[PDB]
């Protein structure tokens, strides 16, 4: 199942192994990201180190101008040591895009997470009532189910359980995910997320093809919710770098082992007949519902952006005029030159 | 093939089994003796050419006095009792004591090795125990009367012929107490006494109860002599199809090695050791019971299941033997106490081995081995207990 991923907004996917001002040399609004290993290896020989100079990087950061223009005293190359170049939109650190031999690519785990959130959204939406939840929670240690039965829907049950006492992270995070995607009777919370119950193992999301580096750049970020110094820059993919992707559905996993798979997604997708046929349409339409409801949040969140800018309006005018499936890879104020972050269509 | 009597002519006769393997007449009579051995009440010492003469002797044959018969040969060897009862007033009632205890099968007969090791809480292995009382020959060069020798021999022999069936059956619990408990001590154990008499005792059975029986026997004997005597015990674990002559030549070598290297020591499991004379293969009982009081209730729960901290991380204790092998290959290096903390930090179990993480100067002062040498004899017996 070969699909094509077009990039609509600025998109940033980044590890945390950031670029450092020892790698940057801002010149003519174009950053040449250096390779300091080869630079240090070709700066001792026919150069100097004084036993310390190339290892003297406990000096304060920034200041790339001297850092080349005197160490390259018309002695080194300008950017033969650069691995690649970017395009400045907007002299400090840079969040690096997740690479692969020096090439950006969309990791399929991020795509699977942004699909599975939509799957959770439609699973709680079109099946989240007490005459569909309690019938399954009673089958797996239904002492939780009699607490569910006081409410007509499990949304209020999880709003209760979140607002209950003794709330840690490890037990309270995965409980709604367990109720939707399958559980097991264990003594911890009277259910436990045994993750092998999940039908998402019938969903395969490959990693993308390598995106071309000539549409890879560095973008400014404003977060207008606090007067804290935010000179934050992210590596990103230009809107227009149409990549490819491979993602499909294993009907030959659900079709065989249709008894042990349980949960509210499995119950909500047994309703539409054979689960081999409707699983793909369920995930695609869950995408189409969730990435429209995010706009429905966002079309009133315009004053909550802080900057009522016409770019946001001209983007929302185009957000619901697409022939594929729009998605999102990552005070709510994360903006790239005012444009939103991470919106791609498939 | 059965006996090593090993020089008959064609006199040997195939019977009492698949009748294609020719078999000596001694072991023809002996399996028939074993078929009467649960229901046997005694023997009757008569002349060698009477009716019902099962086995012979140097002077006299024997008639197996079963539960209803009335044999006479002027002497009746009655087993494990002092009341003669239903034997006539012509013969000489001679009592004799035998540690007799053995697990009856669903029929009532003697369980075999394959019938016994199926009740092993853990791996399917057969436990074999062979002991000795320590420095007893010097103990009988110190009694200066026939009366003192008679009392000091009869009280010793009554332990290894009559007390053993009491300790196996579960009695004497008021002084035995906390031995290494691999499981619950059942009503009928899986323990078959092969030969207990004089000083020594040789007992086969399921290893999870052989192990508990060794410490029960030792601590009850420590109570029984008042601490002035000790007993050495070798232990062994074999496959159920292992020949018995190897099964005894292993534990005899192990009892001799625990005999040589401190004279009052158990040999729990054959461990790897360096060759310098400082690492002893055996274990003092006050060492091993201390260690099982130390490291077993922290890491091992009851009845074949690991502790709730080590639950679902049950390949952790296997890594400690791989750590300990570095100390085995060289005693002078110091990698072992480091890699132990490198293992225990990765799983959060910071406290389960405080002795293994830091090299103790107390042992290297007086040239004693490091505290990671001794813990694996506490590890493997748990590792055989929860293996599947």
């Amino acid at each position: 199942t070969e699909r094509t991923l077009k990039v609509l907004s600025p998109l940033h996917i980044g590890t945390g192994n950031e670029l450092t001002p020892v790698d940057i040399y801002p010149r003519e609004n174009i950053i040449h990201v250096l390779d300091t290993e080869r630079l240090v290896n070709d700066l001792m020989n026919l150069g100097v180190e004084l036993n310390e100079i190339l290892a003297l990087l406990k000096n304060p950061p920034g200041d790339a101008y001297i850092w080349k223009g005197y160490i390259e005293e018309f002695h080194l190359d300008p950017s033969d040591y650069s691995i690649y170049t970017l395009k400045i939109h907007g002299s400090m650190q840079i969040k690096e895009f997740i690479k692969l031999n020096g090439r950006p690519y969309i990791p399929g785990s991020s795509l699977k997470g942004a699909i599975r959130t939509a799957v959770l959204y439609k699973a709680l939406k079109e099946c989240g009532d007490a005459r569909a939840v309690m019938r399954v929670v009673s089958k797996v240690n239904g002492d939780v189910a009699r607490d569910i039965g006081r409410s007509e829907d499990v949304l209020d049950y999880y709003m209760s359980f979140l607002s209950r006492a003794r709330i840690d992270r490890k037990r309270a995070d995965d409980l709604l995910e367990a109720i939707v995607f399958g559980m097991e009777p264990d003594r911890r919370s009277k259910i436990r997320y045994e993750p092998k119950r999940d039908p998402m193992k019938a969903l395969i999301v490959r990693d993308s093809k390598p995106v071309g580096r000539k549409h890879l750049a560095v973008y400014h970020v404003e977060v207008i919710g606090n007067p804290q110094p935010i000179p934050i820059w992210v590596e990103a993919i230009e809107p227009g770098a149409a990549t490819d992707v491979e993602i499909h559905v294993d009907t030959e996993a659900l079709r065989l082992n249709a008894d042990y798979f349980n949960g509210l997604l499995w119950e909500c997708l047994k309703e539409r007949g054979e689960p081999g046929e409707v699983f793909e349409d369920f995930l695609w339409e869950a995408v189409d519902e969730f990435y429209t409801a995010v706009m429905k949040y966002e079309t009133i969140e315009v004053q909550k952006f802080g900057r009522y800018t016409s770019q946001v309006r001209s983007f929302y005018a185009s957000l619901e005029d697409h022939s594929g499936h729009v998605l999102r890879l990552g005070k709510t104020r994360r903006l790239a030159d005012g444009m939103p972050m991470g919106w791609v269509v498939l | 093939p059965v006996c090593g009597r090993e020089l008959p002519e064609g006199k040997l006769e195939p019977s009492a089994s698949d009748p294609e393997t020719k078999v000596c007449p001694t072991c023809n009579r002996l399996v028939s003796l074993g078929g009467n051995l649960p229901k046997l009440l005694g023997f009757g010492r008569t002349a060698k050419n009477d009716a019902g003469v099962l086995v012979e002797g140097p002077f006299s044959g024997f008639v197996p006095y079963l539960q209803g018969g009335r044999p006479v040969g002027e002497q009746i060897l009655v087993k494990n009792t002092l009341n003669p009862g239903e034997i006539p007033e012509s013969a000489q009632f001679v009592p004799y004591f035998v540690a007799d205890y053995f697990k009856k099968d669903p029929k009532g007969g003697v369980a075999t090795f394959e019938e016994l090791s199926m009740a092993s809480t853990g791996t399917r292995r057969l436990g074999v125990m062979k002991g000795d009382v320590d420095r007893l020959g010097e103990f009988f060069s110190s009694m200066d009367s026939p009366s003192k020798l008679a009392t000091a021999s009869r009280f010793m022999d009554y332990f290894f012929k009559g007390y053993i069936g009491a300790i196996i059956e579960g009695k004497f619990g008021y002084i035995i107490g906390d031995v290494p408990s691999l499981r619950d001590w059942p009503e009928e154990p899986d323990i078959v006494v092969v030969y207990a008499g004089g000083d020594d005792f040789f007992i086969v059975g399921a290893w999870d109860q052989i192990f508990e029986l060794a410490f029960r026997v030792r601590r009850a004997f420590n109570a029984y002599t008042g601490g002035k005597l000790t007993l050495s015990v070798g232990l062994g674990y074999f496959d159920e199809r292992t020949p018995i002559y190897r099964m005894a030549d292993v534990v005899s070598e192990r009892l001799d090695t625990a005999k040589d290297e401190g004279r009052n020591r158990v040999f729990v499991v054959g461990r790897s050791r360096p060759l310098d004379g400082k690492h002893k293969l055996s274990y003092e009982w006050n060492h091993y019971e201390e260690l099982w009081r130390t490291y077993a209730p922290r890491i091992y729960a009851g009845n074949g299941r690991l502790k709730g901290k080590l639950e679902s991380k049950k390949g952790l204790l296997w890594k400690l033997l791989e750590i300990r092998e570095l100390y085995v290959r060289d005693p002078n290096d110091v990698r072992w106490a480091y890699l132990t903390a490198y293992l225990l930090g990765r799983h959060g179990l910071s406290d389960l081995f405080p002795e293994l993480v830091g090299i103790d100067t107390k042992a290297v002062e007086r040239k004693e081995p490091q505290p990671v040498y001794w813990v694996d004899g506490v590890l493997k017996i748990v590792l055989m207990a929860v293996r599947r």
């Binding site: 785990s109 959130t117 709604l176 995910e177 969903l203 999301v205 030959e252 008894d259 | -």
Partner: protein
């Protein structure tokens, strides 16, 4: 009852995996001295076998006379009825899971999975007839690892659920996309009529493994193995007994879409 081999067709592998590969151990799996990535045979054999028996589970309804001993089974699962044999095409409790094992010889001699991946159990235990070598990293990537340009780069995921994302991360250390793993695979050939419907029966499984993944978290990438074959050659008993430097060699042009060189299987072939 006979093994009676004459054969050993071999394929010389070359699984250049693209988009990652994460096979796990106690992190990638090089236990020996030259620290490296490698694919350890059994992770390729088991991923071949489970995928092939998933194919046979759905396609037993039409073979069903060809491979006649397959007809003793149902396409269900022995999960509810926890008996070690039930009459369904899943049995053999390993420790808690279930795999297909014919517990006889003559029922395993005809079974279209078990005649190619081996039986077990009481008295039977068929030899697997396939030999799956441990795929070591090729000499090209060894020379390109000695010169820097590191292989087995790490990768961090997170568990960012649908809560306040305090997502606990977990590094994975997969192999770099593009890694020639110098694979080799041997199939024992016995009694020729039992043969042509075997490697043709085998490659389809690998073709499914060309569509599916191997090695770890394949639901989020980590597959795409691309078995670009090298040899397809065959080593008869006519020179294991007398080695005259001769062999019957096929062609390894790109791949097979669906068995294009089915005709060239029998090019110089009588055994």
């Amino acid at each position: 009852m006979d093994r009676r081999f004459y054969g050993k067709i071999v394929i010389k592998g070359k699984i250049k995996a693209v988009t990652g590969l994460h096979i796990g151990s106690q992190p990638v799996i090089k236990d020996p001295h030259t620290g490296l990535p490698y694919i350890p045979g059994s992770s390729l054999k088991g991923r071949l076998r489970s995928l092939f028996e998933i194919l046979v589970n759905s396609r037993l309804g039409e073979w069903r006379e060809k491979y006649p001993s397959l007809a003793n089974y149902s396409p269900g699962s022995c999960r509810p009825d926890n008996q070690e044999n039930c009459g369904k095409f899943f049995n053999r409790k390993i420790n808690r899971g279930w795999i297909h094992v014919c517990p006889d010889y003559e029922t395993a001699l005809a079974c279209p999975v078990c005649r190619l991946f081996g039986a077990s159990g009481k008295e039977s235990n068929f030899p697997s007839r396939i030999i799956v070598r441990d795929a070591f990293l090729t000499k090209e990537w060894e020379e390109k690892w000695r010169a820097g340009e590191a292989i087995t780069e790490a990768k961090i995921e997170v568990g960012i659920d649908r809560v306040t994302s305090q997502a606990n991360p977990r590094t994975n250390e997969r192999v770099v996309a593009g890694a020639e793993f110098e694979f080799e695979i041997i199939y024992n050939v016995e009694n020729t009529t039992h043969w042509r419907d075997d490697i043709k029966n085998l490659l389809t499984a690998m073709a499914l493994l060309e569509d599916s993944y191997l090695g770890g978290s394949g639901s989020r990438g980590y597959g795409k193995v691309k078995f670009i074959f090298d040899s397809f050659e065959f080593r008869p008993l006519d020179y294991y007994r007398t080695g005259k430097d001769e062999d019957i060699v096929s062609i390894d042009a790109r791949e097979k879409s669906v068995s294009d060189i089915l005709s060239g299987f029998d090019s110089l072939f009588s055994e």
